[PDB]
Structure 1
Amino acid sequence: VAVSADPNVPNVVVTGLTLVCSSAPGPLELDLTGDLESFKKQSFVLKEGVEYRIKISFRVNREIVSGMKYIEHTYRKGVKIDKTDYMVGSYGPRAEEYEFLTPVEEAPKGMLARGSYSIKSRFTDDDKTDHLSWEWNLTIKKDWK
């Protein structure tokens, strides 16, 4: 009953990001329990105009977390061109992982919209806790290729 060692398992473990896209020829998942820096040297390719949702896979292990929020600030050629907040909600503990889907979004289209992007994601809550922060890239092209 008096524990000699701490379990060290965070109450909230953000496990993954996935772009749910029917048109995509291959996988589009970020294993967030792994190495996060390597994501900056890779990218997700999305054909212009295609619809997709962003699935944030997380585990709420022990306590109820209120007002969960998933924030994305997107960058193009070094400068921030977008800021989007998504309301995830209040989640109680569970053995089974949670999968939060954002509303249907579209990949941008046009000459001025194609190119390389860089998203700085933050999964947070009411007490503004940093459950996880990571950077991933999205390259918008004419075709999947």
Structure 2
Amino acid sequence: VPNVVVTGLTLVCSSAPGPLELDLTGDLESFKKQSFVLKEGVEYRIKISFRVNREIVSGMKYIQHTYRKGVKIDKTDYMVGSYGPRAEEYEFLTPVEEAPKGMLARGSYSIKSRFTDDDKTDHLSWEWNLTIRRDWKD
């Protein structure tokens, strides 16, 4: 039973018509074929939920690499702190970003996420997708 268990990802967006959630205790492979529809231009944050079970973990680091048609277009690392063990889950949020906009920016983006720390531990790695559209449904 890992000291750190990563439980979920939530794409936080006030104008999305419904929750945008991944259960990171579930089947991670299935996410590679799924996507969240996001309206072009909207503000959003990424929330990662996790628990720390037995020992203090230091220098926690959340990494997203974003790809378009299998080519990397962005790398972003976030330092998220030092966390002691407790029963209550922890969460952090990435800083607000905006979905891109315009015909040449619409379509799917893949994101390879890794959650690690000072010891370079692979707490969890997973891949998921966004689909940028003019509208949430059409």
Q: Same fold (TM over 0.5)?
A: yes
Give the gaps of 5 or more residues in structure 2: none
Distance in 1 separating the partners of 2:130 and 2:18: 15
Q: Deviations over 1:103-133 (max 9, x none)?
A: 1111111222111010000001111110000
How far residue 26 of structure 1 moved from its aligned partner, in angstroms, is: 1.0
Secondary structure, counterpart of 1:40 in structure 2: helix
In 2, Cα distance between the equivalents of 1:22 and 1:86?
A: 22
- 1:99 & 1:107 partners in 2: Cα distance? 22
> What is the CA–CA distance in structure 2 between the aligned matches of 1:74 and 1:86, rounded to whole Å?
14
Runs of 4+ in 1 over 4 A off after TM superposition: none
Identity across the alignment (%): 98
Rounded to whole Å, the distance in 2 between the matches of 1:142 and 1:43 is 15
Quick check: 1:59 aligned with 2:51? yes
Deviations 1:73-108 (A, max 9, x none): 001011111101011111111100001111111111
Quote the Cα distance in structure 1 between the aligned partners of 2:101 and 2:120: 34
Q: Secondary structure at the match of 2:47?
A: strand
Q: Which moved more, 1:103-112 or 1:10-19?
A: 103-112
- Separation of aligned partners in 1, 2:21 and 2:52: 20
Partner of 2:136: 144
Q: 1:71 aligns to what SS in structure 2? A: strand
Distance 1:35 1:67 in 2: 27
Tell me the SS of whatever aligns to 1:112: helix
Give distance in 2, aligned partners of 1:110 and 1:87.
31
* SS of equivalent residue, structure 1 residue 37: helix
Q: 1:139 deviation in Å? A: 0.5
Q: Give the TM-score of the pair, scaled to structure 1.
A: 0.92
1:27 to partner: Cα distance: 1.4
Larger radius of gyration: 1
CA–CA separation in structure 1 for the residues paired with 2:5 and 2:98: 28
Instruction: Show CA shifts across 1:14-59 (max 9, x none).
Output: 0000011110001100000000010011110100110011000000
Count of aligned residue pairs for this structure pair: 137
- The residue correspondences of 1:111-122 to structure 2 (distance < 5 A) are 111-122=103-114
Which structure 2 residues correspond to residues 40-59 of structure 1 after superposition, within 5 A? 40-59=32-51
Instruction: Name the CA distance, whole Å, in 1 between partners of 2:98 and 2:62.
Output: 18
